[PDB]
């Protein structure tokens, strides 16, 4: 302990500090690497050079498609090319599968009696209300069909 303290005294702090992925920054790191993974697969489909200003405007469909997934709104873009819509629909099904699995795991830990935050129980109630009303809407739709 005192070795680290005294070397910070004589020698500053290391500028090379990297951040371990913890519970605090996991839902952010999933986003960073999801969007890198999407943007690579879309940059490879293009026959042109995209020149890089277009890429950050392409990913807005990924964000809007995820918002439409959560709200159970169907997300049709009128003039969208077909394989790009397939790529976005693929990665949103990926994110939604991880989302549903995490909701189930945290509700089982809430039932069993494990320690859990207050914010985590509010987040889990907000997740499960989406999942319930999505099941409800699909039940209404299958009855009408």
């Amino acid at each position: 302990y005192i070795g680290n303290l005294i070397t910070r005294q004589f020698e500053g702090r290391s500028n090379e500090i990297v951040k371990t992925t913890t519970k605090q920054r996991l839902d952010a790191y999933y986003d960073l690497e999801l969007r890198n993974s999407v943007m690579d697969d879309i940059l490879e489909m293009m026959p042109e050079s995209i020149r890089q200003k277009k890429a950050r405007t392409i990913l807005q469909h990924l964000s809007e498609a995820w918002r439409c997934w959560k709200a159970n709104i169907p997300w049709d873009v009128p003039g969208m090319p077909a394989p790009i819509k397939k790529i976005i629909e693929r990665y949103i099904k990926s994110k939604a599968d991880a989302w549903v699995s995490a909701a189930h795991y945290n509700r089982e830990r809430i039932k069993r009696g494990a320690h859990v935050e207050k914010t985590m129980v509010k987040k889990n109630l907000g997740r499960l209300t989406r999942l319930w009303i999505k099941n409800e809407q699909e039940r209404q739709r299958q009855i009408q069909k």
């Binding site: 807005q60 964000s63 003039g79 090319p81």
Partner: peptide, 14 residues
Amino acid sequence: NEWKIPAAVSNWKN
């Protein structure tokens, strides 16, 4: 012409 992606308008964020 086939690979023009339309501009994104969102109903949540502006």
